[PDB]
Amino acid sequence: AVGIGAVFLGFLGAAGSTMGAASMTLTVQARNLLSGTVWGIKQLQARVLAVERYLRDQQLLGIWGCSGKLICCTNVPWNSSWSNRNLSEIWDNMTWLQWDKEISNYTQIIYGLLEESQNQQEKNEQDLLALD
Amino acid sequence: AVGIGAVFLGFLGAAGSTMGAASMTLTVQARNLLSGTVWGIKQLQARVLAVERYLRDQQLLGIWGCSGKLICCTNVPWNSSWSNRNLSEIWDNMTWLQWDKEISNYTQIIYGLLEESQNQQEKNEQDLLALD
Amino acid sequence: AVGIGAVFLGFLGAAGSTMGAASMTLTVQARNLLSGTVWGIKQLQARVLAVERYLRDQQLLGIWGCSGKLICCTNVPWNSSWSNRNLSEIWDNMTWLQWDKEISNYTQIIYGLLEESQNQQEKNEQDLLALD
Amino acid sequence: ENLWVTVYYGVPVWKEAKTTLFCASDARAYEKEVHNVWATHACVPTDPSPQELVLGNVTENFNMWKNDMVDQMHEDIISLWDQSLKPCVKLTPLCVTLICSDATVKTGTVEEMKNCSFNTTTEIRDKEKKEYALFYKPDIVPLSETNNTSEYRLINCNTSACTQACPKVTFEPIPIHYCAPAGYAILKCNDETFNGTGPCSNVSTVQCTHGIRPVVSTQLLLNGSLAEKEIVIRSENLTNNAKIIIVHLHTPVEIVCTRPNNNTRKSVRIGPGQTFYATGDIIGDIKQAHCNISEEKWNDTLQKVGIELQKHFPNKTIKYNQSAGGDMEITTHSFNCGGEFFYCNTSNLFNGTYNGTYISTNSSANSTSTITLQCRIKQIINMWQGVGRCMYAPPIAGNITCRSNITGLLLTRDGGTNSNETETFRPAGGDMRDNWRSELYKYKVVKIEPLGVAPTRCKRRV
Amino acid sequence: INCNTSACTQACPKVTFEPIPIHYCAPAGYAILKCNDETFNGTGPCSNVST
Amino acid sequence: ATVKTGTVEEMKNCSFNTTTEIRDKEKKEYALFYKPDIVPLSETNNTSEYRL
Ligand SMILES: *[C@@H]1O[C@H](CO)[C@@H](O[C@@H]2O[C@H](CO)[C@@H](O[C@@H]3O[C@H](CO[C@H]4O[C@H](CO)[C@@H](O)[C@H](O)[C@@H]4O)[C@@H](O)[C@H](O[C@H]4O[C@H](CO)[C@@H](O)[C@H](O)[C@@H]4O[C@H]4O[C@H](CO)[C@@H](O)[C@H](O)[C@@H]4O)[C@@H]3O)[C@H](O)[C@H]2NC(C)=O)[C@H](O)[C@H]1NC(C)=O
Ligand SMILES: *[C@@H]1O[C@H](CO)[C@@H](O[C@@H]2O[C@H](CO)[C@@H](O[C@@H]3O[C@H](CO)[C@@H](O)[C@H](O)[C@@H]3O)[C@H](O)[C@H]2NC(C)=O)[C@H](O)[C@H]1NC(C)=O
Ligand SMILES: *[C@@H]1O[C@H](CO)[C@@H](O[C@@H]2O[C@H](CO)[C@@H](O[C@@H]3O[C@H](CO)[C@@H](O)[C@H](O)[C@@H]3O)[C@H](O)[C@H]2NC(C)=O)[C@H](O)[C@H]1NC(C)=O
Numbered sequence A, B, C: 001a002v003g004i005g006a007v008f009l010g011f012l013g014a015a016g017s018t019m020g021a022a023s024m025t026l027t028v029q030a031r032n033l034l035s036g037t038v039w040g041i042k043q044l045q046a047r048v049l050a051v052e053r054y055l056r057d058q059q060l061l062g063i064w065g066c067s068g069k070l071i072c073c074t075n076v077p078w079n080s081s082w083s084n085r086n087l088s089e090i091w092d093n094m095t096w097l098q099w100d101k102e103i104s105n106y107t108q109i110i111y112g113l114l115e116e117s118q119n120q121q122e123k124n125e126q127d128l129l130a131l132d
Numbered sequence D: 001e002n003l004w005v006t007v008y009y010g011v012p013v014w015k016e017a018k019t020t021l022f023c024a025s026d027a028r029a030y031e032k033e034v035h036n037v038w039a040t041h042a043c044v045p046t047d048p049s050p051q052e053l054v055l056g057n058v059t060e061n062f063n064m065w066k067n068d069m070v071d072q073m074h075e076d077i078i079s080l081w082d083q084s085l086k087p088c089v090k091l092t093p094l095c096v097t098l099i100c101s102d103a104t105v106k107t108g109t110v111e112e113m114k115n116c117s118f119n120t121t122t123e124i125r126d127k128e129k130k131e132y133a134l135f136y137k138p139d140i141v142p143l144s145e146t147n148n149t150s151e152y153r154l155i156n157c158n159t160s161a162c163t164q165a166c167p168k169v170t171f172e173p174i175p176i177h178y179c180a181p182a183g184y185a186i187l188k189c190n191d192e193t194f195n196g197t198g199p200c201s202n203v204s205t206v207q208c209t210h211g212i213r214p215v216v217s218t219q220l221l222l223n224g225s226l227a228e229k230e231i232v233i234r235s236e237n238l239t240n241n242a243k244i245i246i247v248h249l250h251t252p253v254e255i256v257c258t259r260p261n262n263n264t265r266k267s268v269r270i271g272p273g274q275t276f277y278a279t280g281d282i283i284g285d286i287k288q289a290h291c292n293i294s295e296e297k298w299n300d301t302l303q304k305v306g307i308e309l310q311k312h313f314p315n316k317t318i319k320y321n322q323s324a325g326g327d328m329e330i331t332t333h334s335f336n337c338g339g340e341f342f343y344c345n346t347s348n349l350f351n352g353t354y355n356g357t358y359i360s361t362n363s364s365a366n367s368t369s370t371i372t373l374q375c376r377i378k379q380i381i382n383m384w385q386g387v388g389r390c391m392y393a394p395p396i397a398g399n400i401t402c403r404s405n406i407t408g409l410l411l412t413r414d415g416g417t418n419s420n421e422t423e424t425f426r427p428a429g430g431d432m433r434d435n436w437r438s439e440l441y442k443y444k445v446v447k448i449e450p451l452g453v454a455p456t457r458c459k460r461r462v
Numbered sequence E: 001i002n003c004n005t006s007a008c009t010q011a012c013p014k015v016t017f018e019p020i021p022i023h024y025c026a027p028a029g030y031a032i033l034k035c036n037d038e039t040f041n042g043t044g045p046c047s048n049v050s051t
Numbered sequence F: 001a002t003v004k005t006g007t008v009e010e011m012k013n014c015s016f017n018t019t020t021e022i023r024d025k026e027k028k029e030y031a032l033f034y035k036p037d038i039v040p041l042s043e044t045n046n047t048s049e050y051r052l
């Protein structure tokens, strides 16, 4: 109404549209997070920090795989302690805002698991490249 | 004479060599675009801006696919309104400088189309990953 | 003891563990190299330079392929002038620190070769895409 | 069996760095009043832990006298110091004809308190008031071209204009745990014996250096670290008479300094805004300013140093002379205890010289015998020889007492062709670089260089 | 009046002092939210909240 | 100067009182200056008084 421009050029528009909505749109959000006497420092710091954050996130995506697709399967199963909801509930009723209030726990557990599944994959690939 | 160093470490050397020439060389050009009291601000701003431009371009390449190859097919057909020349004319006689004077129209049309073909691909991939 | 955190959040911990050790760990090292009146300039310069170095390295990795895996085969054979050691000697006894003292010669030879094998690959891919 | 090349991103290797470090201030000196604390306001507080590494088999070459980091330290201190004093107390109005007279005279320690009357500009520029300030010795200079008259001038009037101090600012050493920028790391030697240079064996990593408190001092270095196992005698070249020997002692020695006379304080408004501070009158009796040092421990130290020193100068007696002579800034020990500036006469501290047997003989006693040095205080100083940054100290009221655990030593060497049975050492100092070099030496700064190459034989299908 | 205080200035005679609205903008990575709600006591759960 | 040749006339000997290292003390000193920087004092009448 609105549309993608307002939703993601602008921000968070889909926050209320439930997370299944996101599957068709989480693109633009990323590109618009990388935009661009003493005030020169204030401005340079702001610019630099935005860049640093951006790049740090890219580094994590790289490490875990896959990663250029923005949506990746990392071949790590869910721990049952995190499976208290149905997928339909998660995707059709819940928002990212909402999910993120509870799934906020065990963040580093996931990151650890993602990093490690990739490390194992890479070794397996090198062994196959060596055999092949 | 010249060679790649002068052409692309330096810039635009192939501009007069017609675009088919580019197929063997558009590499170095990219890497040399990422190089590095009050003058400290002038210099920091220059450095920061170069970085921001670089990264913003990388973000677009990412979004459209493919994208790490620098030359990618995006599986979008040409609109006939843009097909007033033969491929041989485009690749052997025209320069990038020259092409860019006319093909400059409809820039965002292309970008829109590229973004969308990728979005569709990604959904199709997730559906196949889900089936598989 | 130590572990990955001290070794690679901190730096160079594996330097003494011989290069075969590296095959399981060279991940974290990369992410922690991208961290973040007049002193404002000193700090901004430091931040900016760290970013520039990081990105320049990423650009080279991109150009040579493969490149998102951090460990890549580039399909370039070794020149016999560089084959004065066995692989077992290189991987099990030598360190990266040590290897790097001697293999330091011919750095650009390798880079040239890597860039070119990728350039040829890309042409071959385009010809196949054209045929296909 | 053909070998194929692979690239390894993120390999653990390095090269010598040429970059800068930063605060890393201690995050404890921070409170609302931090804006009134020198070299803390400007800094960022941090609280990082020590690193576990231990790089195992790895060894590395260190060189204390080549570590450029010390210059960074010097340059910043000069510039931080200078910047912190800009928005205040210009004393140019003071350089007027000054009139003064003797205390009582009598005891030399009382004579010095010259009552100094002068005319100063009032809040109204047209109105002038006659006021007096107590001043002593060197800042008060007989007026040029007078003839033993009551007319005097301020010392800096023939130089450049000076400042006093922003009265609100605290000058107390705060350790800065200097940290590396991303892409860099710091290495340190955990080795004893280390001559200041060479192939350290077990070499720890460092994220941030252990903080070091900057100190302005000469000769004896106070509020510093101790050798872990034994006295370390270190020099760029022991056979070069032009070099200064740096000594890290194993055990501490205690120094107690003080200024006994109760001193009152007054202030004078000069024109608008800015007030000037000066001594009203020393309000008590006038007694000497001194530093108590136990004799026992000092005579134990000189021989222990002599024993270690003897290793490089064998079959010779070690003798300790006084300074070569010069201005107090050259020959005396300097302290900033309490914020006041003391210059203390070293003799007879280093008066002795024990036979090259250095026998560690002493005995139990109920003796509390001490060696006492006497001190001369100043009001105007050239901070770090910064004549162009010259400043007047604010006066401080009441009596100053001051500890602590010392010391690092700065020594030089003498003796001609007419001895060579003994060698003579003297007090030395004046270069701020050595004061920090003394502790900075533990660390080396390196850059991490990711992305290396190795054969593997494995190949990519494509 | 100021002679017993600190020295004062007048004004650079050329400078205009007139309020100009500043439409403050967010840095990249940030966004600003606003309440379009009436009743709002100065705190609390605003309903329709514009970006 | 001497006057005479126009190229010599211009070298005006210019005496003045300047603040000494002591602000209270004043010294009478002269500096050689020529032509334009030395301006007849405003409101004087062809006198020896000048301004910068
Ligand atoms: C830095 O280092 C210096 C030393 O290099 C040190 O200086 C010494 O300070 C101490 C501080 O206590 C001084 O101690 C005083 O010394 C006097 C002198 O007496 C000596 O000589 C007489 C004869 O001339 C002998 O009889 C006597 O035994 C000593 O050898 C003492 O008299 C002082 O003790 C008495 O006086 C105190 C009050 O002043 C009383 O509280 C105390 O009870 C003692 O009373 C005695 O005398 C009284 C006289 O009225 C009498 O009524 C009492 O009944 C009793 O008999 C005290 O020991 C020492 O002399 C200083 N030495 C010198 C030469 O300077 C600095 O203090 C040190 N600075 C620091 C600490 O930083
Ligand atoms: C330094 O010199 C100054 C004088 O330039 C001394 O101040 C003067 O001290 C004398 C004696 O205390 C004062 O005389 C007294 O004046 C009061 C009234 O003010 C009168 O009631 C007493 O009977 C006596 O005449 C004199 O006024 C005072 N001058 C001032 C106010 O500047 C100062 O004490 C000397 N300081 C030292 C430590 O030597
Ligand atoms: C060397 O180290 C010793 C030991 O830390 C230092 O002694 C300390 O000196 C400071 C002076 O700033 C003392 O602070 C002072 O406290 C008094 C109240 O007693 C206050 O009135 C002062 O304005 C100031 O805050 C500090 O207490 C004291 N510490 C101890 C335990 O004695 C010494 O200053 C350091 N430097 C030198 C030159 O020795």
Ligand SMILES: *[C@@H]1O[C@H](CO)[C@@H](O[C@@H]2O[C@H](CO)[C@@H](O[C@@H]3O[C@H](CO)[C@@H](O)[C@H](O)[C@@H]3O)[C@H](O)[C@H]2NC(C)=O)[C@H](O)[C@H]1NC(C)=O
Residues within 6 Å of the ligand: D347, D348, D351, D352
């Ligand atoms: C360095 O230390 C030596 C040894 O302590 C000093 O030499 C000695 O100094 C003392 C104190 O002056 C002398 O004692 C005095 O002698 C005079 C003259 O006979 C006498 O009148 C006094 O009552 C007192 O007894 C001592 O004789 C003298 N010589 C020795 C070998 O002890 C030397 O002065 C010190 N030098 C410095 C730099 O202070």
Ligand SMILES: *[C@@H]1O[C@H](CO)[C@@H](O[C@@H]2O[C@H](CO)[C@@H](O[C@@H]3O[C@H](CO)[C@@H](O)[C@H](O)[C@@H]3O)[C@H](O)[C@H]2NC(C)=O)[C@H](O)[C@H]1NC(C)=O
Residues within 6 Å of the ligand: F013, F014, F015, F030
């Ligand atoms: C500019 O005017 C000044 C005076 O305001 C000239 O300086 C003066 O020059 C005369 C003649 O050289 C000096 O007279 C001499 O004084 C010395 C002792 O100083 C005496 O021994 C000689 O017998 C003679 O009387 C006069 O003192 C001196 N005044 C000063 C020192 O300022 C200056 O020469 C003139 N400059 C030019 C280039 O016209």
Ligand SMILES: *[C@@H]1O[C@H](CO)[C@@H](O)[C@H](O)[C@H]1NC(C)=O
Residues within 6 Å of the ligand: A016, A017, A018
């Ligand atoms: C709010 O949720 C309801 C029920 O899921 C949905 O029909 C409605 O479109 C949502 N509104 C927005 C714009 O998020």
Ligand SMILES: *[C@@H]1O[C@H](CO)[C@@H](O)[C@H](O)[C@H]1NC(C)=O
Residues within 6 Å of the ligand: B016, B017, B018
């Ligand atoms: C200019 O164009 C002509 C004809 O295509 C070509 O032969 C010539 O090499 C070109 N010169 C350069 C250096 O671009």
Ligand SMILES: *[C@@H]1O[C@H](CO)[C@@H](O)[C@H](O)[C@H]1NC(C)=O
Residues within 6 Å of the ligand: C016, C017, C018, D055, D056, D057, D058
């Ligand atoms: C040092 O090398 C030896 C022999 O390869 C090895 O056993 C030891 O673990 C290494 N130590 C470290 C921590 O690098």
Ligand SMILES: *[C@@H]1O[C@H](CO)[C@@H](O)[C@H](O)[C@H]1NC(C)=O
Residues within 6 Å of the ligand: D097, D098, D099, D118, D119, D130, F024
């Ligand atoms: C101060 O002013 C008084 C009165 O005007 C005068 O008598 C005295 O000499 C002046 N003192 C100085 C040193 O200017």
Ligand SMILES: *[C@@H]1O[C@H](CO)[C@@H](O)[C@H](O)[C@H]1NC(C)=O
Residues within 6 Å of the ligand: D158, D159
């Ligand atoms: C100021 O006077 C003192 C005493 O004569 C002298 O030593 C010093 O060099 C003088 N300074 C200058 C620059 O005139």
Ligand SMILES: *[C@@H]1O[C@H](CO)[C@@H](O)[C@H](O)[C@H]1NC(C)=O
Residues within 6 Å of the ligand: D052, D053, D054, D190, D202, D204
């Ligand atoms: C270096 O050697 C000393 C020997 O006492 C040992 O205590 C220390 O742990 C080693 N390295 C470190 C981490 O300090």
Ligand SMILES: *[C@@H]1O[C@H](CO)[C@@H](O)[C@H](O)[C@H]1NC(C)=O
Residues within 6 Å of the ligand: D195, D197, D198, D235, D236, D237, D238, D239
């Ligand atoms: C010890 O110090 C000397 C200079 O005093 C230096 O030349 C030497 O290399 C250092 N290391 C050794 C081997 O003692």
Ligand SMILES: *[C@@H]1O[C@H](CO)[C@@H](O)[C@H](O)[C@H]1NC(C)=O
Residues within 6 Å of the ligand: D320, D321, D322, D351
């Ligand atoms: C120090 O050396 C001088 C000669 O330069 C000598 O006269 C003096 O006695 C010596 N002082 C001592 C013995 O410490």
Ligand SMILES: *[C@@H]1O[C@H](CO)[C@@H](O)[C@H](O)[C@H]1NC(C)=O
Residues within 6 Å of the ligand: D328, D331, D332, D345, D346, D347
């Ligand atoms: C230092 O003390 C000695 C011994 O009293 C004396 O001879 C010398 O002149 C003094 N030097 C100073 C700095 O006054």
Ligand SMILES: *[C@@H]1O[C@H](CO)[C@@H](O)[C@H](O)[C@H]1NC(C)=O
Residues within 6 Å of the ligand: E004, E005
């Ligand atoms: C200046 O004088 C006025 C009038 O007495 C007084 O109220 C004010 O506090 C004075 N200011 C100072 C700082 O002396």
Ligand SMILES: *[C@H]1O[C@H](CO)[C@@H](O)[C@H](O)[C@H]1NC(C)=O
Residues within 6 Å of the ligand: D299, D302, D303, D320, D351, D352, D353, D354, D361, D362
């Ligand atoms: C201590 O050593 C000095 C030489 O530095 C000597 O003159 C003195 O006699 C010695 N005293 C002791 C405690 O043996």
